[PDB]
Give the backbone structure.
Amino acid sequence: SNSQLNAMAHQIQEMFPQVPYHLVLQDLQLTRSVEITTDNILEGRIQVPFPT
Amino acid sequence: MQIFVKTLTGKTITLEVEPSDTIENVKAKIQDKEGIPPDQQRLIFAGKQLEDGRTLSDYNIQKESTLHLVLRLRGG
């Protein structure tokens, strides 16, 4: 269904307007916790948009 | 002045602060409302992280601005 999962991921997008939505859903399937997800993202767990 | 605190749970908290207020103090005010210690409180503004020893005037946070409160959990 991903009803709650997608909704939660969308909530993070409303907090971090610089992270790709597809990268948010990545950990949303792992930890499944917006808290641990955004925290880990801020820790560098997810490769933030880096100009190459 | 009044500001809007955004949470990952989808709860907009309205708190009163001043431009000369310190980020650390703001987190302390949130701890009084939510109960979550400032140590696990990651304040983000416009996508940037707010350091404890900084004031609202540092990041140029005006009134009615939205502050993002990210929770920290080393679990999972």
User: Anything to note?
Assistant: The first helix of chain A runs from residue 3 to 13. Residues 1-52 of chain A form a domain with the Helicase, Ruva Protein; domain 3 fold (CATH 1.10.8.10). The two ends of chain A are 36 Å apart (CA to CA).
